[PDB]
Amino acid sequence: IETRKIPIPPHRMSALKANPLVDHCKLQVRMNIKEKRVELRSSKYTVSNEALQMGADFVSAFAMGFDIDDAIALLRLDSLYIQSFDIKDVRQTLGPDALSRAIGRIAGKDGKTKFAIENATKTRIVLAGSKVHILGAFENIGMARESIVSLVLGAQPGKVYNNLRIIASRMKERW
RNA sequence: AGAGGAAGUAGGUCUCCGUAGGUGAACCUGCGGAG
């Protein structure tokens, strides 16, 4: 018998107050969004450390900016990963014109560039300033990560999107 | 002004917060900030 408690940011508290993991994995839950904690407890119907760690990963992935439409995908498919890239990781210049210009390049007006990158490499990303979070299979996470870091190296989004599309097609192909 | 003669050229998304107005709890728009 093991328990795991996770902290949540003060962003998604109403969305966590929305309504089930006891039905999903037979693992008893408690919540308190004023101490920012969510208790996960394993019962006699709870069988595996896989179920424990996957419930923990599902709740933390809902906490870090994804909704349930992209979180029950993590509850369901075991090939699905999350990777959280800080924009402060590997940096091309020392100059502090970073945050606004970089996430203006990555996000794009009305979400055009983030959305086209998502549709191109089949991954699902969310963007909040310094931290950008990628969800999907880890080769798609590698594709989205190399596209985003080539966006912050200062390459144009048209050329980056073209190369991303051709790499995504060659990765979809079997032989 | 005249019929002839002869010639030549052809780039801030999402979420939250503080605002100000709107039709009020909520909610919408605009702005200023943090993730």
Curated annotation (Swiss-Prot):
Main localization category: cytoplasm
Source taxon at top rank: Eukaryota
GO molecular function (one): RNA binding
Residues of the whole record sequence present: 80 to 259 of 259
Subunit-level organization: Component of the small ribosomal subunit, ribosomal RNA processing complex (SSU RRP complex).
Family to which this protein belongs: Belongs to the PNO1 family.
Keyword field contains Transport: no
Record's GO cellular component terms: cytoplasm; nucleolus
Purpose: Required for small ribosomal subunit (SSU) synthesis. Has a role in the processing of early nucleolar and late cytoplasmic pre-RNA species.
Localisation: Cytoplasm; Nucleus, Nucleolus
Keyword field: Cytoplasm, Nucleus, Ribosome biogenesis, RNA-binding
Keyword Cytoplasm part of the UniProt annotation: yes
Domain named KH: residues: 96-148
Record organism: Chaetomium thermophilum (strain DSM 1495 / CBS 144.50 / IMI 039719)
Single Gene Ontology BP annotation: ribosome biogenesis
Protein name in the entry: Pre-rRNA-processing protein PNO1
